[PDB]
Each structure stands twice: as structure tokens, then as C-alpha cells.
Scaffold this active site. Structure first.
Site, short mmCIF file in Angstrom:
data_model
loop_
_atom_site.label_atom_id
_atom_site.label_comp_id
_atom_site.label_asym_id
_atom_site.label_seq_id
_atom_site.Cartn_x
_atom_site.Cartn_y
_atom_site.Cartn_z
N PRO E 1 2.58 7.48 2.93
CA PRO E 1 3.58 6.69 2.27
C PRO E 1 4.82 6.60 3.13
O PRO E 1 5.03 7.45 3.79
CB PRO E 1 4.08 7.13 0.90
N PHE E 2 5.80 5.63 3.10
CA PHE E 2 6.87 5.40 3.87
C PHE E 2 7.86 4.67 2.98
O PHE E 2 7.87 3.71 2.17
CB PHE E 2 6.41 4.11 5.10
N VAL E 42 6.66 9.59 5.30
CA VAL E 42 7.51 9.54 6.27
C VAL E 42 8.80 8.66 5.76
O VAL E 42 8.71 7.91 4.91
CB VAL E 42 7.04 8.42 7.54
#
EC number: 5.3.2.-
Lengths: 64, 67, 65, 67, 64, 66
Positions: E1-2, E42
Site C-alpha cells: 500500500p502507498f 510506503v
């Protein structure tokens, strides 16, 4: 490093194979040019509808 | 197409020359893989401070200060 | 709605008054076009260095020669 | 210049016509205020589901049910 | 996931400690609600000038 | 503030109720850590296809989700 690519799908593309090539290629670019760690590279590809992407004031759909 | 690259500066880099190689590299890549038009390719490189980039729940500033 | 604008500074600009005109400008457009409540509109402006913006495979800095 | 607009579709909108109006309007604004070259302006419109957009701690969808 | 967080600095903040609190808090929430793998998360925090952020038609700078 | 979350849907998720938790959770965090006014927090959640997310040179799909 983070890499976001936004593109307009065209003539039956991109395929899952071409997406893989883009991912691996940009990743290797960071290694060879910047000597970066390859494992931490994140890449995200967004496919935008032709009616939602504008270039020079016109939708790519219009332009097509 | 549009390409946004976010990275953390390190050991004096990246220089404008390396940045130019990155811009030229990714562009040529779009051409080689998708046969896109080079002229309309936009690339933006964002340089992020080590204290603002987190990996695994920790900032890169911490990680770099290890080994 | 949310609007993000990324641009390369040039010839002294953009000034704060200019940035304000962009904010008010895109905001009113949304009301006019979609009759959105102006209260919930959010706009963000980002400035990028000439050596960090590429167009056609060359940096904006080189294009400006 | 690069512009990215994200919005929640409402009552049968926006139409492709309304989208062009937004692309045209935003692009003209960039010329009017910054004297930028219109030919190199890129705009991207993202449409978000009422359940994936939050405002003040609640989804746009829940806010509607309250009315 | 960001996760990308964009905020306007104010009254001396945010400090690096607060940035770490955001980085960890956001990461923990992802593990907690979706049971994601924490190592691959991130997060990037962008600090935006008060003259570059608008709400309701006015810049955060003018808001008084 | 503005928060953008990008994730890959996995095993029948996320649900709308989960998205609500994510929205409320991220919002409360800004309130607690920075003392922000809740009303001005905007959160957007994007769901990305596994063949479009790359990690370490390979796609999440090739890695078998995440």
C-alpha cells in the site's frame, strides 16, 4: 523510490505482459543510473479513460 | 503519458546529468515497450527528505543510520 | 472535490496573488459546471524545478537552453 | 503544467460534455493567469465512489443519508 | 500500500517526531483494519506552503 | 489536510464499513497528532489492480497478492 505512471489505453493495450516490462525496466533504470536497491522500488500504473485525459485543451478521445 | 518519480537524495546525488539520464531513460522505455510518442511524454521527479519518506513504519533517515 | 496543480516556476512567477487567482478560479468553475458547494473544495499547488521536469525526453532546463 | 481533478459523481454527472468543459476551463485558466503554453498542458480527471471519499470523518455517502 | 499525506505547516510544526508518529500511525492502521504486511508499506509526507493550499475558494494563508 | 491511500483489493475486501473505519481512523489521527479541525480533513481511497502494482521489479499479481 516511488514511480507512478498514468497512461491512456490504446488499441488493445497495455497487456499484463507489457505492464511487467514497464515495471522491470523502470526498476532496472534506478539501479544502473543511481545504484539503488531494487527490492524497495514501488511502481503503480493508472489507466485513464480517453474522455478523462486532456492534452492541449482537448480530451484524448476528441484528439484520437 | 505521465510519469511521476519520487526519491530520496543520497551521497551527493542525483546530479542534473543523472536526472537527464532518468528523463531520457524512462521516455525511451515508453517508446520501446508501448510505441508511445516521445514528444508528449511528461516526467516529474520529486526529491523527498529522508525524514518524510517511510518504509515499513520507519523513516528512511533512521534506516540509513544503521548497518 | 480535490484539485492538484503541478507547475514549473518561470520568470519570477507565480506570485501569491497569482496563486490566489488559480484557487478562486478553479473553485468557481466547479460551482458553475457541477453546482458544487464551494465550501468543500480543496486545491493544492506544487512548484517543480526546471531540472526536474521532463517533456519529450529533455529537461525543461535544457529546453530553455 | 499538470492538473489532476478528483470528484464524486452526483445525480447523473459529470457528463462527457461537462468533463470537456472542465478540461477547457482549467486549461484556459492556466493561460489567462500564467501565460503558459496551452499545447503542453496535461489534465487528468479521476472519478471517486461516494464510499471512497471522506469529508469531516464521514463518507460522502453517509453524509447524504443524513439528508 | 502507498499513502501520501499533504499538509500545511503551522506553529513550528510538524517536527520529525510528529512525522514519525504519522508514518507509524498510518502504517499501523493498515495492518489493523486490512491485516496488510507492514514491511511493504510506503508513506510520503509532502509539506505544502500556506499560500499554495486552498479551501472554500481562499488560500489557508488568507483564512482569518 | 489531504490524505490519498492506494491499495490492492484482497480476498473480498475492503468493504464499505472498512473504508469508513479507514476514513474515520486517518481523520482521528490528524486530530490527535496535529490538533486539526476534523471538518477540513479530506481522504481519498484508490483501489489498484494487482497487475498494475509493482514491487521490487515484479507485479503484486506475480508475487501472489502483496
Amino acid at each position: 523510490p516511488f514511480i507512478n505512471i498514468k497512461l491512456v489505453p490504446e488499441n488493445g493495450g497495455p497487456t499484463n505482459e507489457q505492464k511487467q516490462q514497464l515495471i522491470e525496466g523502470v526498476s532496472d533504470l534506478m539501479v544502473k543510473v543511481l545504484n539503488k536497491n531494487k527490492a524497495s522500488i514501488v511502481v503503480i500504473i493508472d489507466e485513464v479513460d480517453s474522455n478523462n485525459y486532456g492534452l492541449g485543451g482537448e480530451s484524448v478521445h476528441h484528439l484520437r
